[PDB]
Amino acid sequence: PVSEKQLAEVVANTVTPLMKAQSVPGMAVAVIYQGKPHYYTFGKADIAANKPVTPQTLFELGSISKTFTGVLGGDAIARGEISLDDPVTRYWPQLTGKQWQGIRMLDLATYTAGGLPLQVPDEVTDNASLLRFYQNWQPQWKPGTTRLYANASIGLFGALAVKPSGMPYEQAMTTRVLKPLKLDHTWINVPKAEEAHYAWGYRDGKAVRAVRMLDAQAYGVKTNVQDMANWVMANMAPENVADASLKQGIALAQSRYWRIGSMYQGLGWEMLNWPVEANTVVEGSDSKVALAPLPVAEVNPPAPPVKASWVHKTGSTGGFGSYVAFIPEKQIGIVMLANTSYPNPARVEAAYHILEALQ
């Protein structure tokens, strides 16, 4: 039964050395423990303007955005709007190239379509060029054999998953995920009016922010630590989410679809069985591993959420680096938002150390 006093010490004693070693200007942290969020803020949101990080500071989540995509897609499945076992072409009949036969919505969502690349290339700017890109793509692997982390994969999933709803992605996300969960300061483009809360990111000493398609779905969300804490709590404990499809969608996103070594792929979320040692998680976070094409083992039918899991996701942009992790069995979790992109293994190491203090 670690006290709030002790928890505050552990967080400060971990984060302060981390910020110094990694040259991080500002960090917002939330620890979920004993049924509530505990908030800790450090440093500066804007160095030149000498603005401190507060619980209202907005950070760029980068690829943690994909957890919102996964849950939104889960919600759509629970509504009966889509099935992961449907072919991609069900939702895009203009995608007539025969290499798409046998590629399921599941494969887009979980990076197993057979080599869709990390990025959608910059000449893709409209539906005609999106179509040309996917029509021209030649798979390196058969479907369901190789996991290659890819915005071009889950991004397209997110676009197609919302088609039945008739809403564009941002509206579908806001209406079906953010608003029901009272995530009222979570944005794709930050309204002019909220600009005062937006941190600057920092890269090699320069203040930077993300530029204003499939980007929202893969890396475009901005939020503060309060909304992110409440996001983690909803995913940790969907039993407390009242909306029946949303509750189911959260579970579908934490279901295991594939095993890749020591991890399992969900919809956005990734999982390891708990207990897990720090080196397992830290070593898996290295880009040389995380971005590699690796063989998969199907989990068929998908395994529903396992409470004894380390559930996590890293996310970065040019100027920001964030991490979230939680353990449903223990009802503990953490959010670490920062306005510099520092190495993923260091994020995991710090997060693991803090949560270890609580178990």
From TrEMBL:
Biological process according to GO: antibiotic catabolic process; response to antibiotic
Claim: Zinc is one of the keywords in the record: no
Sample GO molecular function, one term: beta-lactamase activity
Keyword Protease: no
Reaction equations catalysed: a beta-lactam + H2O = a substituted beta-amino acid
NCBIfam families the record matches: bla_class_C, blaACT, CMY2-MIR-ACT-EC
Protein name as catalogued: Beta-lactamase
